[PDB]
Write a protein that binds this ligand. Sequence first.
Ligand SMILES: Nc1nc2c(ncn2[C@@H]2O[C@H](COP(=O)(O)CP(=O)(O)OP(=O)(O)O)[C@@H](O)[C@H]2O)c(=O)[nH]1
Ligand SMILES: Nc1nc2c(ncn2[C@@H]2O[C@H](COP(=O)(O)CP(=O)(O)OP(=O)(O)O)[C@@H](O)[C@H]2O)c(=O)[nH]1
Ligand SMILES: Nc1nc2c(ncn2[C@@H]2O[C@H](COP(=O)(O)OP(=O)(O)OP(=O)(O)O)[C@@H](O)[C@H]2O)c(=O)[nH]1
Ligand SMILES: Nc1nc2c(ncn2[C@@H]2O[C@H](COP(=O)(O)OP(=O)(O)OP(=O)(O)O)[C@@H](O)[C@H]2O)c(=O)[nH]1
Lengths: 426, 426, 427, 427
Amino acid sequence: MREIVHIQAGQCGNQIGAKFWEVISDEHGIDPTGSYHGDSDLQLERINVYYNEAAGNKYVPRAILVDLEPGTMDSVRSGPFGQIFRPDNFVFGQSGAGNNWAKGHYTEGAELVDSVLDVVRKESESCDCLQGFQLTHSLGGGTGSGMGTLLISKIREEYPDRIMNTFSVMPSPKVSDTVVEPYNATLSVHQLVENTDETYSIDNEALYDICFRTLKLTTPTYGDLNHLVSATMSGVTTCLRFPGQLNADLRKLAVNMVPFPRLHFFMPGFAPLTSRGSQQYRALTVPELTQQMFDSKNMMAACDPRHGRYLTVAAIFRGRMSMKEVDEQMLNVQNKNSSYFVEWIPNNVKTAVCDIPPRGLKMSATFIGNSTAIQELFKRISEQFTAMFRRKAFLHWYTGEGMDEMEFTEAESNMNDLVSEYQQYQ
Amino acid sequence: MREIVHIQAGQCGNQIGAKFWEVISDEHGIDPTGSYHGDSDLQLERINVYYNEAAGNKYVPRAILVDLEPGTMDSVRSGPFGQIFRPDNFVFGQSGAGNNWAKGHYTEGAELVDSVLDVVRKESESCDCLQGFQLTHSLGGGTGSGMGTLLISKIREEYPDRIMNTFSVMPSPKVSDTVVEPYNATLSVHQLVENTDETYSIDNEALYDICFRTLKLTTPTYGDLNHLVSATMSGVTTCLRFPGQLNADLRKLAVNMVPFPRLHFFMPGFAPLTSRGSQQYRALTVPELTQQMFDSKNMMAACDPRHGRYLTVAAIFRGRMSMKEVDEQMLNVQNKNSSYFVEWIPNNVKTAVCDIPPRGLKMSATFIGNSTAIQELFKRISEQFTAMFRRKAFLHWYTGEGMDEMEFTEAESNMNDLVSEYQQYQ
Amino acid sequence: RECISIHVGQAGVQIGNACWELYCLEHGIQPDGQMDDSFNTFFSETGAGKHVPRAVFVDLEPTVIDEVRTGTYRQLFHPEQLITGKEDAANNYARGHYTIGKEIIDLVLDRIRKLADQCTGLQGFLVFHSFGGGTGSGFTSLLMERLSVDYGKKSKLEFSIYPAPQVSTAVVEPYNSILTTHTTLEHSDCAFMVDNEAIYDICRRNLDIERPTYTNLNRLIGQIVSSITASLRFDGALNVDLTEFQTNLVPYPRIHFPLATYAPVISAEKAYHEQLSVAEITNACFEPANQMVKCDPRHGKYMACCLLYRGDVVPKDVNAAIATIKTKRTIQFVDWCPTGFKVGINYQPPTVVPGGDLAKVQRAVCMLSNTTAIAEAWARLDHKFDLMYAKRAFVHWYVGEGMEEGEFSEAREDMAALEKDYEEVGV
Amino acid sequence: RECISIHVGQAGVQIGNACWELYCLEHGIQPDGQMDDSFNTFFSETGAGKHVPRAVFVDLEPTVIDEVRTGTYRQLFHPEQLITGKEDAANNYARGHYTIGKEIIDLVLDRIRKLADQCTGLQGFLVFHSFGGGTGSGFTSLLMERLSVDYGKKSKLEFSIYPAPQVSTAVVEPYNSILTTHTTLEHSDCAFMVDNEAIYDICRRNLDIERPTYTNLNRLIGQIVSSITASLRFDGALNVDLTEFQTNLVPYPRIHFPLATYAPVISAEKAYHEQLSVAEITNACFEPANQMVKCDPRHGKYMACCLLYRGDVVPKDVNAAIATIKTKRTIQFVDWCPTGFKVGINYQPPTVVPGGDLAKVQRAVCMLSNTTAIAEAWARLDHKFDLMYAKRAFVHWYVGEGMEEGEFSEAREDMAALEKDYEEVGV
Ligand SMILES: Nc1nc2c(ncn2[C@@H]2O[C@H](COP(=O)(O)CP(=O)(O)OP(=O)(O)O)[C@@H](O)[C@H]2O)c(=O)[nH]1
Ligand SMILES: Nc1nc2c(ncn2[C@@H]2O[C@H](COP(=O)(O)CP(=O)(O)OP(=O)(O)O)[C@@H](O)[C@H]2O)c(=O)[nH]1
Ligand SMILES: Nc1nc2c(ncn2[C@@H]2O[C@H](COP(=O)(O)OP(=O)(O)OP(=O)(O)O)[C@@H](O)[C@H]2O)c(=O)[nH]1
Ligand SMILES: Nc1nc2c(ncn2[C@@H]2O[C@H](COP(=O)(O)OP(=O)(O)OP(=O)(O)O)[C@@H](O)[C@H]2O)c(=O)[nH]1
């Protein structure tokens, strides 16, 4: 019944994945021990779409947690929710990737991905009818960037019809936590655009910006950022997890958010994002959520949407709400702000509403957006790439794993072609 | 429904604005926490015209509190009513204006006004139909004078049809609290006369004069002066806040009080203004209020009205009262005192009466007046301007922010032209 | 809203002995260095229950920098801030500027940069020195040149100590005063002056201290500097930041020399037998008997007068007080600045030093005045320099350092060019 | 995740005296050798309630290897690991490489193989030596040739100690430094350098130790090596293994010479009077006054900068700190590596040595930097060698060992070929 096999790769992908299971397990009322204790029976209706039934009324997620550093699994295993996962899914090597794309893609992960592919086959064949593969990885480093795109190639090869969903956390020069960022990013997106059908471009710079301005946090840890990214993952799959007045599958999001097959790089958002002080001074009405959704500063990517135009956007709402006020707000945000929407598409908005809000909150919304302004993330990464590639710095560490210089050239051409096509429809 | 977005700029504008929310919140029976506890349901009828409905029967004012010194917001936040305001509206810089018009208008406030304009758009688009912008600022100093007129230019640019209401607190030489008073005043009114449609010229010298003569206060603090200025703000908007036998909108006051577009500089008043001793020795009848309204000494500006003539005056009454006695007093004050009223206008008076008096008082009135005698406030400021401008003292601190000497010349010409036109119709 | 201080020479550090004594007293900061937002202007929090000043003490002679290191304020001051030299400038403007100056500015100017990046709300600077010795004169003009070119846009509050008209501690200091003013004219944004026999005369007449030492002088000098920065440290009816002094008192970019004064200067026994209100203390601050420099204001005119009050003072009575000042004809403002008045009010009153000489009062005034009365002090200071300079008296020490006939002539004509502005604005 | 160490020469074993003092202290390992997964990187469990290092001490002179055998750390070290020679290399690169080198490498290289098979997660190597004497120079280049050909793929962390620019313990060591670098260029994967007068100057200025001995130096040197391997021994927000240093700091396979530094270097009494955050310690590590070698960074450019932090340090403030480093123009990166930054965070803070000199701090930084500033040290070290080599000074000892005119010329042109790369990448 439209099942979803979940993949986690890299330290960042395991961290956002670890917190992701923390959030939705509380939405379904699942104990850390895995036993179901939810109040409403609707939580147990579509529990199969992320869990498997086990004896003693126990459940286990279909989470294939991949890495090359064993320390990441120990943190997840020792966490508040490590005990719910199957111990067999923890496939992990001994030596880390060392922030090399070619290691995870050719030497380190290439021997390990064959063992991981058997577990993907185990969880898939146990399904009734899987819809897509929800993958979480960062383009920074070697594990998520190199081994992750290799794993995407094999799953896309065996499953050329399912929905290859990815959440590519790609940083900016404003937060440069690794010198080998452009080679890891430029080579990873060379494989993603050819294979995947969804690419949620999330940036750490934008994620820190949410914590100061609208969330108003003094000390935003990575766990606070993981809570925000988990909210977007739970929002896009809320239609196919609970009853709703308009249930849009991930395929039904992909059909509307992808006007051409390469233009599938998105920019997520979430609301209400209120501070502790601004809780009582804010109305829960629908127009207040919509202005926060389309707010240019409340995007989870470094590219401001005002610098370009939306090809097509989606707004997956949650909780009880009138459809008429939703339709007016979806109508009004394209009338007055028509400069930020291409007019050769007549209606650039997709709507959806579930009858179950998040736990603790009365109403909520989740934004998807394929903007022409997103190309500047690829433009600045190309500037960093060509800055280091013009003198060939740090390329010899990729030649040791058999990777040739032409593969960097083919990635840069496919990268620069992606920048030109968003500039076409701007 | 004729909504009003409120602006507060400068220390004086924030102080009179802070006390202004204290008064009307008690008129509507609003707690400091924001919850409504009024006795009469008519208070909750037009509560939207200054507040927004929130969850838990809570309300929040549409108060955009602007400054360049953060200490002013801390006093308002720590005040008796700081907790009712939205924490997001407090837009404020780090460094004060230093009593420089050019800083707030070009360097200090010019970067901050762009952030403030987004909040004006937030409160405006949430409205159903806004009528006008009620701004409070002093022409003394750099914040209210420089940044305030800049903010008025942008709002007037985007909203060329709404009612730009301002309360310009302009001092006299009798109370010269700052050496840079004429440059702050002469440059501010250069922008106000071209853009705004109401300018309530209030003077600190007249405000202190009320406390000694008719109020009979030993130690008049600034808070006592803020209570008097708040009474005038609540009086002019009383028609569009409660039911009344004659409801005059601010546009319906502007149409009668502005015979020519530049002649929109007013002189407010309020009654009954009785001391603690003279409470029982005074009748609450309507003719007693009228003689106190048109009293030459009970004006809130340094210019005596006997030195000129009224082009057009308004008297917004409050509380239950017969219309006939109001019409006779409006009639009698132009028959015998016809020398103080221009006769090329046949009827120089505007009347209005609400069916709800102020809290604690049985009856009340509020005066507006556009007199030809008001030009002496502009004349004496021009004398102070030309006294310091003849040798160009303290002008070099304005050249650092790019302001040129011709802008002082253009302000002085527009200032002196304003003096000549009131002398025409005298 | 921060402002970092430096202290040059024997006079500067001796001011810092008493000036920081009353700063830490006003915020409840013991000499140990511990007991919310008021003390952040001049004290940074260090971890948990500890404070450190944003202070720097520099003196090329090691005589008194180590005295603080072994005095009572050992724990309060971070010991690396207490910078010291190796040998003395010895009353030579050139020695503190070129030979011994150029060996330690590389330490202290880069250290002043360290406090700048440690801070965020740096409003300006306030230096403490004197024109007597080579340290306060030579090293400051060297440091002010390198601090001005480093930042430029920030302000600098120069609290100098003149040599008195006839009283004097040395003989060569006219060379120091005329040379340091040649460089201080184009660099300092505000130049506050103090005199030696005037402050001796004030406490003798009003405070009744017939035998004062220098520690008695520095108590009220720190009170003067504490008064102008109290508006930044506490809230009031009308606060004034450091930027107001540049905009209100400097009508032209060269005449930037205010005059400081303080009142009520009243002892402990006279406080009970005398009522203090804003009127009498206002008139007390304008008379020549209470001005901090030996110059009579009736000879010249007040160009501007910034009245900074403290303690419980309402805002309506000050307007009555300044009205009496405007109608009194013994003191008269210039026609080009008729509204030559600025008011500042602070609710927190002054604090009494334990064991000091001043008495606690519920209200006090610290009036700053830019006027042409200082031109008389410049003339007599320039006049006495001409007799020594004509005979080449004490010139062989400065030119032995490296100088020549030239810069003495530049210092002379610069002083005449400065006085050319005062006689011009005196019209 | 293991890494076995070797210690050559007097400098290497003297580092091991203090370096292993703080390793066993950090894991609660007493000198007896007993009190979960943190200590496995540098300590193997022996049966029940006992630990042994993965350490090897080699020194051809028996002077100080037996000092550990009779010191306080007798029970901790397995006595067969403490390998010793019979006679001294005596400041001759050739004597420690051919005559006395070739009689003991057969023992220690096969013994290093024994620890390899005893281990499973051997990441690489970390050797400790100096270019002063023949032991640290000759024996290491001999052993590195036989260890490189044995494994090759594994990494090697070379913590050498230069001779200082003007300070020096001997006269012949320029021959040792130029000859050992001829072989170390093609073998060592990472070459970390240390200077003698720099570490003397750092603790004098910042730590206030006017009279340090060598045991005071080795405390912070072990802290530097402990900092880079703390990410392997403990968990953090963003851990970095040994393989990151080869991929991040070596843009070309020949320029593999980082520079180490450490901050905050603060005493016990100055910790209370100074607040420690990530901003000031970050700027403190880039200035020339805290670099471990006598080379100013402003003369050259930073090619890469790996910032390894410890203790409670959040990940959002470091991004603000490196932003200030990028906009500050006194230090500037090369255009070919604009994102020349790597961050590493560890929750476990540094540990204070009992009876040492450093003070306990809640956070610390150990910044590694690959730059062209070391080319100045190569030039002056190569320049001083030319005067002795031109007159054939001290050549009769090396050629008496067996060498000739040839390899001195190969060592000279290899150094010029090394400097040919630094002037090339300095564009
Ligand atoms: N929003 C979050 N971002 C994270 C988190 N952890 C890391 N990151 C960011 O993602 C960037 C790279 O992602 P990873 O940490 O997963 C590097 P990866 O594990 O894939 O390779 P190796 O660790 O070298 O084997 C990283 O530089 C951070 O900017 C996190 O917990 N939350
Ligand atoms: N009736 C009142 N008048 C006030 C009050 N506060 C100040 N004022 C008067 O208004 C004059 C100038 O207004 P402001 O205090 O707001 C100076 P502003 O804040 O706009 O500039 P900066 O403080 O320099 O940033 C001022 O000199 C007073 O005469 C008040 O609370 N009530
Ligand atoms: N008001 C006041 N003046 C002081 C004080 N201490 C010193 N002075 C004056 O400062 C003048 C010289 O100051 P400095 O430049 O610091 O003298 P110095 O540091 O001893 O210079 P050297 O002789 O080179 O050591 C003297 O003439 C004094 O009149 C003080 O505590 N209060
Ligand atoms: N920083 C630091 N340097 C040291 C220390 N011990 C020795 N050195 C340096 O090491 C250099 C020589 O090192 P070695 O090769 O070990 O000298 P050696 O072992 O005595 O060589 P022989 O004379 O043949 O015995 C000297 O010039 C010292 O400057 C130390 O504990 N700390």
